[PDB]
Design a protein around this motif. Structure first.
Motif, short mmCIF file in Angstrom:
data_model
loop_
_atom_site.label_atom_id
_atom_site.label_comp_id
_atom_site.label_asym_id
_atom_site.label_seq_id
_atom_site.Cartn_x
_atom_site.Cartn_y
_atom_site.Cartn_z
N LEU G 11 0.78 -1.09 0.07
CA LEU G 11 0.06 -0.05 -0.03
C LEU G 11 0.99 1.23 -0.04
O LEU G 11 0.36 2.16 -0.54
CB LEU G 11 -1.18 0.00 1.21
CG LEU G 11 -1.90 -1.17 1.27
CD1 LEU G 11 -2.75 -1.19 2.68
CD2 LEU G 11 -2.90 -1.30 0.04
N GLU G 18 2.24 7.51 -6.14
CA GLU G 18 1.23 8.34 -6.01
C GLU G 18 2.05 9.99 -6.03
O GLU G 18 1.52 10.78 -6.50
CB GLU G 18 0.21 8.34 -5.17
CG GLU G 18 -1.06 9.40 -4.98
CD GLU G 18 -1.83 9.19 -3.94
OE1 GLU G 18 -1.15 8.85 -2.70
OE2 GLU G 18 -2.99 8.91 -4.35
N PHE G 22 3.35 13.14 -8.75
CA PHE G 22 2.80 14.38 -8.49
C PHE G 22 3.98 15.42 -7.96
O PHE G 22 3.91 16.75 -8.35
CB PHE G 22 1.91 14.37 -7.07
CG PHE G 22 1.30 15.69 -6.75
CD1 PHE G 22 0.19 16.15 -7.62
CD2 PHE G 22 1.85 16.44 -5.76
CE1 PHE G 22 -0.37 17.27 -7.03
CE2 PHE G 22 1.10 17.61 -5.16
CZ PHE G 22 0.00 17.93 -5.93
N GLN G 24 6.29 15.35 -10.09
CA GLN G 24 6.43 15.72 -11.41
C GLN G 24 6.68 17.09 -11.87
O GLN G 24 7.08 17.76 -12.62
CB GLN G 24 6.09 14.68 -12.55
CG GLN G 24 6.38 13.37 -12.20
CD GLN G 24 7.78 12.94 -12.38
OE1 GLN G 24 8.29 13.21 -13.45
NE2 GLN G 24 8.35 12.32 -11.20
N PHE G 25 5.45 17.92 -11.28
CA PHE G 25 5.18 19.10 -11.72
C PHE G 25 6.41 20.15 -11.31
O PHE G 25 6.25 21.04 -11.90
CB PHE G 25 3.87 19.45 -10.64
CG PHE G 25 3.44 21.01 -10.64
CD1 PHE G 25 2.91 21.39 -11.88
CD2 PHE G 25 3.55 21.69 -9.56
CE1 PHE G 25 2.30 22.73 -11.95
CE2 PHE G 25 3.03 23.06 -9.75
CZ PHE G 25 2.33 23.59 -10.92
N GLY G 26 7.20 19.52 -10.47
CA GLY G 26 8.27 20.71 -10.35
C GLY G 26 7.95 21.54 -9.30
O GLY G 26 8.49 22.82 -8.99
N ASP G 28 8.02 22.55 -4.97
CA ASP G 28 8.44 22.04 -3.69
C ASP G 28 7.64 21.13 -2.92
O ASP G 28 6.32 21.12 -3.10
CB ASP G 28 8.80 23.34 -2.95
CG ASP G 28 7.49 24.13 -2.60
OD1 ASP G 28 6.80 23.62 -2.04
OD2 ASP G 28 7.70 25.40 -2.97
#
Lengths: 59, 255, 214, 132, 119, 116, 127
Positions: G11, G18, G22, G24-26, G28
């Motif tokens: 899990l 997950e 997320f 990946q957005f760059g 902080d």
């Protein structure tokens, strides 16, 4: 009433008067431009020589 | 139904659904060892529906002025309107009332995708009482679907586009109609007229539902004479347009 | 590559286009909205800077470095261009400590020199900055940072040359001690009683910073 | 060169910019000061008071938050502040007393916050004299 | 590793991972660009792109196509070559200098020739 | 409505609309973050995440998989639970307090046991 | 035995992917999203095992133990590699009694956890 003794910088000395003034006027002639002009959500954090940091606090 | 049509009357027939019919016919055709086409449908499958839908029409005055309307139902598989059967049907009919599950979940019920739903006959078969307030309703909704992404962003939106959002949210909220609860034209016009002009923009987008209830009951007790004139005449004269507006602004005010 | 995988993927790219294509127009609004905060900060800046013009106040003969940035992304090459300029000026005086304003730019330099960083700010990229916030930030630089002792202070900000080009900019902040040694000072009447030079530093540091962020 | 060019601007709005003025009255740390056409180059700190720009015609008077004032050798005064305030039609006595009284209670609150209260008292008291 | 050696195994693997990380971000590159790539990711791309170009090799048989004399490289030198690129000892040299190059020495040689051609 | 009750229908419909908008903003919560969302949106999104995890329920049959003892919730209590969550009466409780939980009482009990 | 040391591990690795997608957005990351990101990234590195190298049960439990808890968080990623071999050699030399109990018993008692706990922390301190 010393400001440069145990008060704050000259930038803050005029600051307190800027908000006091902007908040001493009519509530009708108070555009939203002035509201957010006195609003801020920035926090500062002191760092060390080893990427370390201190407990976060409000400006 | 043609009986009614031939004898000079009006009959409405709903095929629910043609999709199942084709499957049945496909079964017979295959078992009889007839040539299999796209998706296992014989070449005469189109000749089937075309020879069915073309049976409904509008007889001339000499024939009896009789008429037969057809509402065929087709079930797509994941929005795939490009499938064989659907392509056949959609090509023959004279308009679609495309429905999407997604629109259903949001609350918009019945979920009739205004964007796709079309009618080739259009106003030709619509009450002028409603046509006078519907000609513009297709416009606002049209621009609303284009500026629908902006609604997701902050208030940084200019006032021009923002106005569209104000209408769309409310115009879309009005179309939401509970099941088993049809309304006559006399009750539709008042709701559309108040929506188009924008007398609901000031009202909360949460109270739009109860707005219809309390508004209709109002007219049927104070302006009943207006409703009945629209039901009989079927049109809206400059006098009514002014009388309807005054009655609306009065209720919106007291609200 | 099945019809379903291409239909589902092709659909999610289309959503992205709608998200970006709308992001642009929304950007055009915040652009004009930052022009009123940009012109009002430059015109005012010229008022205070006019004094330093007619009155030479250059610096003669430990250093504080401040970098003005945001915290949001998707802005092109703004956190790379500035993080490169400060990097060059850092090679000449590595000892000079840095205090960047932006969690985003922080990580940029926090990799190259995690020592120099001793203070950072967050939550400014949101809306247009005001003097109320600017003077408050400059205040902490004098309380816990003690910028009054630093002989020379430098500031880094991005000067928009055009809507399709930017230029990294740097502007020094002369301190109290540098106001006295100003070659042209005697021409201006002043009373050494109200700490005029002292109170000029704590104020200049605020405005210049505000004209940098805005 | 006749007259003196005034440059009264703020971090949010600019009022005067290269505009000729007959006389100006802005409170200074040393004390109240006045300026005219030709004036000796002086650099003084402005305190939370009231400024008045004079013209051949009736002169307008605005309340200032504070800042610096410098008279350039070339006969050019530059006023820098934060916020501004119109004649009297902007401020209200009722809106002031509300916070004003609350300031005296800030001394009662923790000193960290009372420090700023002392600074408010002064500014507020001067607001009352503006009523005239 | 029980055949080509432990080092050879590790160098090869590193080359793959690097090339793989470039591929997994390819979607992002066409949409946003490298400006949106993180500091660590942006460095791997360039390095990766350097490794890819380096893979090319002039073929003596295909000299009539490339116009460049064949280049025969030994296994021993090839391993050391990439390994040296992984260590980041050639991040200064331009990518073009890795394109259609034989021996690792020829890379630095070709890099120097490009300095005189710059005007 | 004429079957499950008027109250039951409304609560059920609200839950569906919440989970839908959530899934509709999935393109913004990854491309612009959670901060870009409006005050009405963020408040909804949080709830949508709580309800979503609140739908999970431990079965006595798959007790060997989850390790948690089965829980059987009554319809009369079920509707009363989400209703309460839809009104924002538990906007303070943590999301992890709704994951794998039976009755609404257990949510509050769990949220308190974690705090220890 | 192995059931105890890894309960929501699968899990957790789900949460990792997950959080990994997320970030990946760059943008902080706070303490929470980075903490799990630090551990989740190392658990994936601990699972990597060479072919032709089957590991007994008595050697899997200890490794997973130090992972799910968070004793590897304070170690560099390229270190997890040699860490595994070193840690094993440590137990086979010193704390070998424990390996013998886990093997036979196949479960973890209140006492076995105590010793196993101290054996882990003691090794982290080393080097």
């Amino acid at each position: 009433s010393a400001w440069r003794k145990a008060g704050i910088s000259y930038a803050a000395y005029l600051n307190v008067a800027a908000q006091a003034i902007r908040s001493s006027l009519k509530t009708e002639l108070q555009t939203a431009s002035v509201l957010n002009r006195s609003q801020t959500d920035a926090f500062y954090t002191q760092y060390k020589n080893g990427t370390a940091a201190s407990e976060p606090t409000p400006i | 139904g043609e009986w009614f049509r031939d004898n000079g009357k009006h009959a409405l027939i709903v095929y629910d659904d043609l999709s199942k019919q084709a499957v049945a016919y496909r079964q017979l055709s295959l078992l009889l060892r007839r040539p299999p086409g796209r998706e296992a449908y014989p070449g005469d499958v189109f000749y089937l529906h075309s020879r069915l839908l073309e049976r409904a029409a509008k007889l001339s005055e000499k024939e009896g002025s009789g008429s037969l309307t057809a509402l065929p139902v087709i079930e797509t598989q994941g929005g795939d309107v490009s499938a064989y059967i659907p392509t056949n049907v959609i090509s023959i009919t004279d308009g679609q009332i495309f429905l999407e599950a997604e629109l259903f979940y949001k609350g918009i019920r019945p979920a009739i995708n205004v964007g796709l739903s079309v009618s080739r006959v259009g106003s030709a078969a619509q009450v002028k009482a409603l046509k006078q307030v519907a000609g513009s309703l297709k416009l606002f909704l049209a621009q609303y679907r284009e500026v629908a992404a902006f609604a997701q962003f902050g208030s940084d939106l200019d006032a021009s586009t923002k106005q569209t959002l104000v209408r769309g949210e409310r115009l879309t909220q009005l179309l939401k109609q509970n099941q088993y609860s049809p309304l006559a034209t006399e009750e539709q016009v008042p709701l559309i007229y108040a929506g188009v002009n924008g007398h609901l923009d000031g009202i909360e987008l949460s109270r739009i539902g109860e707005f219809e209830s309390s508004f209709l009951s109002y007219l049927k007790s104070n302006h009943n004479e207006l409703l009945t004139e629209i039901r009989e005449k079927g049109e809206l004269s400059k006098e009514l347009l002014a009388s309807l507006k005054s009655a609306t602004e009065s209720f919106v005010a007291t609200f | 590559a099945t019809l379903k995988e291409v239909e589902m993927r092709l659909k999610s790219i289309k959503n992205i286009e709608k998200i970006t294509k709308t992001m642009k127009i929304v950007a055009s609004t915040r652009l004009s909205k930052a022009e009123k905060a940009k012109i009002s900060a430059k015109k005012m800046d010229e008022a205070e800077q006019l004094f330093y013009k007619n009155a030479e106040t250059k610096n003669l003969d430990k250093e504080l470095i401040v970098a003005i940035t945001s915290d949001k992304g998707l802005c092109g090459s703004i956190h790379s261009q500035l993080a490169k300029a400060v990097r060059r000026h850092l090679n000449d005086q590595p000892n000079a400590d840095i205090v960047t304003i932006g969690d985003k730019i922080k990580m940029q330099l926090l990799r190259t020199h995690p020592n120099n960083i001793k203070l950072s700010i967050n939550g400014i990229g949101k809306d247009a900055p005001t003097f109320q916030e600017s003077a408050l930030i400059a205040d902490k630089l004098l309380s816990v940072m003690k910028a009054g002792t630093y002989p020379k202070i430098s500031i880094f900000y991005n000067d928009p040359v055009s809507s399709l080009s930017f230029e990294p900019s740097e502007k020094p902040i002369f301190n109290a001690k540098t106001i006295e040694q100003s070659p042209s000072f005697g021409k201006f009447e002043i009373d050494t009683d109200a700490n005029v030079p002292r109170d000029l530093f704590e104020y200049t540091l605020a405005n210049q910073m505000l004209t940098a962020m805005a | 060169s006749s007259g003196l060019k005034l440059q009264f601007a703020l971090p949010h709005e600019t009022l005067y910019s290269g505009s000729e003025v007959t006389q100006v009255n802005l409170p200074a740390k040393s004390g109240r000061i006045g300026v005219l056409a030709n004036h000796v180059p002086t650099v003084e700190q402005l305190l939370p008071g009231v400024v008045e720009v004079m013209e051949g015609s009736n002169s307008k008077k605005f309340f200032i938050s504070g800042g610096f004032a410098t008279v350039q050798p070339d006969s050019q005064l530059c006023v820098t502040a934060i916020e501004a305030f119109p004649l009297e039609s902007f401020s209200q006595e009722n809106i002031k007393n509300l916070l004003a009284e609350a300031k005296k209670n800030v001394s009662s609150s923790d000193a960290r916050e009372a420090a700023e209260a002392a600074i408010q008292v002064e500014v507020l008291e001067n607001l009352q004299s503006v009523l005239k | 590793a029980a055949v080509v050696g432990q080092e050879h195994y590790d160098v090869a693997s590193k080359v793959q991972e690097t090339l793989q990380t470039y591929k997994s971000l390819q979607d992002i590159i066409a949409i946003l660009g490298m400006d949106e790539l993180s500091e660590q990711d942006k460095l791997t791309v360039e390095r990766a792109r350097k490794i890819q170009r380096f893979l090319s090799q002039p073929f003596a048989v295909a000299e009539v196509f490339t116009g460049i004399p064949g280049k025969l490289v030994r296994l021993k030198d090839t391993v050391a070559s990439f390994k040296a690129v992984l260590e980041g000892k050639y991040d200064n040299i331009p990518e073009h200098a890795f394109y259609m190059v034989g021996g690792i020495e020829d890379v630095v040689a070709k890099a120097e020739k490009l300095a005189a051609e710059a005007n």
